[model samples]
Target: PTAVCSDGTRVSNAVCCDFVSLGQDLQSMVLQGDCGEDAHEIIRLTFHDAVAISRKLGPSAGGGADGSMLLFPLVEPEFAASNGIDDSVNNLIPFLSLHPTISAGDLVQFAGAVALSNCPGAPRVQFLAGRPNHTIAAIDGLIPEPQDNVTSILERFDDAGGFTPFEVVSLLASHTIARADKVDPTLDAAPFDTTPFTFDSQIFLEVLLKGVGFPGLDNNTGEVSSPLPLGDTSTGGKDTGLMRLQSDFALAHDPRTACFWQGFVDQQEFMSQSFASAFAKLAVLGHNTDDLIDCSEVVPVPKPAVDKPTTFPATTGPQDLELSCLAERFPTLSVDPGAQETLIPHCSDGLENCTSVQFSGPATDSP
Candidate 1:
């Protein structure tokens, strides 16, 4: 028997069609018809599930994209590095129960692909089916922490599959539409940039700006937006009502990655194409793409750019930037008019609008 989807994705088996329905369900269930807080969680969950690996150790240790995070629920979620992920994993588990035939690995990756589609200016992320469900849990510390310096973070990414400096920066574009949820209940849902729901290059532009004090100096180390570099206040950015992961600031200023980080500033096409390519690789870490079904056609197309010529948030100045990209002079971007930097809204602000899906799992307090 032969079948094809409305999108012309040739079906080799019926499971692929399950993805078509899965894609549709995710639009409402996970995305709530728009890219918001829930959408941000789905993206975060997919990375946690996919990026764990070890070049130094063998199989008893975890590998990539095998769904170990969800497979052994008692594990990774409890990790300090994995803070606030407990609810995120619980929020998405029912979908696995709904689609019994899909592997946990496939479900996680596929859900990520679906979530990004609802975001504006997001490049279409790919989904490859047939990652085997695994019984092993990723080692406790394999995932990179927000506070890890650029050297250690890049080392772990290198272990994950030799992720180049450029590739890591490309994937950091995820922060473009990201925000902090459980990281700080006090902040109520601090965004990473002025436009939290739209997938744009503002994260890159703002990283070069001066960072203010941590959001109320929260106890969570992961919550730092852009703190001033240690005693080196001569350059950097400001308080834009946004929180950047400390590692985000490190990469923007580090001599090794700053060049790659600067490459994405207001560069939408490079951001999109390379992000998809790196994200595609990230999704299939231990498995070979040659073996998996290219179920990308099942992925929903993302909406267009929130506003064209993706410019810097207004009120930014040349003096405000920590321009470390010494390979070439950084390009001047057109900043919108305003005294205040563009501040984005929280996704949870939309209960019905952003979180329409009922998280059916029993809720437990995150540690």
Candidate 2:
């Protein structure tokens, strides 16, 4: 039975066509149909829902992209690993009643794909809808924290189903559109990159920049300046006017991961495709590949990334962002001599179209 949607979204699996509307409602009702903070949070939510179970620990261990995070939100969010995830959890909670047939696990992964579709430069993430709702919470402390050293972080990734360091780097790219309300609440929704709402590869560039000082905010232990220093704690990649986690900082300089991290700079196509592919794998951690359906056609295609070079912030030069990335040859990029980025403006909840933080630079020389 072929199903055709009002927007001409058709699915050969007629029952799955309503799932297309499910994706739309998540955009309209919860995410305000915009690529703002809420959309960012939904992408993060899918990771938390999938991050910790070790296949070695067996079925009783309780983790995977099972949507159990939403099932026992009160208990799961209490874990520091899931700090500040409540906003996303609460935003989608009401829908549990709305879509009686859809499992929370499916809602989580689909919401993430839907959110990805709305963002500029984000590739369409694949969505599959047959996960059985599991209510048990994921075991605590096994998930990687921002402060974990590179070695420990990789080991945890290995234990949690052997995600490669490059895969970890790809997964962390979602942070480009995210912020740290808890990591630096005083920063007041401090963003992770200069252009927080758009899914771009600048995060790979910005994190390679020099660490300046923090901007009038209490430094959280989980945070780092582009890269944490031997003695400094309050400062980090201030050039982006946002924060980077220490784990992210370490990976940027680590011999095992630095080159791969540097590979995304200015390479939007590679960045978009790799992150989308990694996100798809992470979305189905515990499921059999044969059991899932590829409903990717129902997912909306993303807008192109902003048309501009991945430039340096105002007043910053290559000298500062230079000599890093494990001494790898960093690519050349322009500087946005116009406006420097400020904390991303808060988009109103449920507002249909929220303005994204965009880059506006001085007029270029055509000749």
Candidate 3:
């Protein structure tokens, strides 16, 4: 579940896997993981972080899957955010904002660590690098509800920006690593895979093969009234994009996008490699893309010395980003509205002995 680095730094593959797993868990926790509002913003941010780490690592670092694997920890704060209640606020900002300084180097190093460990869920991870050190402002109103339907989901992704169809499936395959189980009597949870403990593209295959069931009608919907048919939000059966939201179902039905789905399900190495790459790309969607050209180089960008010390800046407040944000910022479909929120403080908020910021440098060599 966890491992230690050569330098004695602790790393956790479980933490990475949990990011995907928690979505389902939180969802079942009673719509707590609603993919709307604050919750949605956190997911988008995590995706951004994943993309940033992937790009920074470049093509050589095994395609950035390491970053994807590390995403599990991104959900750890959920335990606290949920406030021990399934539906209570599972806000990620408190945990991320309160932590010590985080740098591009630290993210890549962690990604590398996850890859090298070859832990249970490590294979399907990725990385990105060379992101700027500037703080982000929190976005508002971008996250949508579970009932948001196909149009809203697509619109949300479009808003996040720069995600291609392949990229969309790659990230959604997050379903493979985790799931949501009902806290009440349903006892239902969408386990990432039948083999929930491992990381693979079975979830993608699931989306292709069986699809998923909708909210009502107990019997198997047989792909109709199924979200999986269109790759809808439900966890069973297949259907037309009409069965659920057109966008969610589009993951499976769209012929143009199906190849990537099949590619991931068929090749373990490719799945692992591609997942990492996708994560990195997603993380840096709105940030500077110029730094991503040389994925192999681990050297930090050089900065000039300043005459006087500058005061730290405050984190950006939350705002609702339109789907156009991604189109304006990166390459890909700009139809979905990706929600986001950022928390940065000039100084640490003392609790659990956390630092305001956590910083790290690039890894000169692989672990």
Q: Best by TM-score, which number?
A: 1
193-250: candidate 1 lDDT, tens digit per residue: 7677778888888878887655534466765545222211113222225677778988
Whole-model lDDT per candidate: 0.74, 0.72, 0.34
Please give the TM-score that candidate 2 achieves against the real structure: 0.86
Over 4 Å off in model 3, which ranges?
Answer: 1-45, 48-99, 103-121, 124-137, 144-155, 181-185, 210-249, 289-367
What TM-score do all the candidates reach, one by one?
Answer: 0.89, 0.86, 0.42
Q: Which residue window of length 10 is worst by lDDT in model 1?
A: 229-238
Q: Relative to the unseen true structure, what is the C-alpha lDDT of residue 228 in candidate 1, on a scale of 0 to 100?
A: 25
lDDT of 1: 0.74
* Model 1 spans > 4 angstroms off: 6-14, 218-220, 223-240, 347-367
lDDT of 2 at 87: 71
lDDT of 2 by residue, 295-337 (tens): 7677778767777778776656687773445555777788766
Tens digits of per-residue lDDT for model 3 on 315-364? 11112111112112211211212232111111112111222121221111
TM-score quality measure for candidate 3: 0.42
Span of 10 residues, lowest total lDDT, candidate 3? 309-318
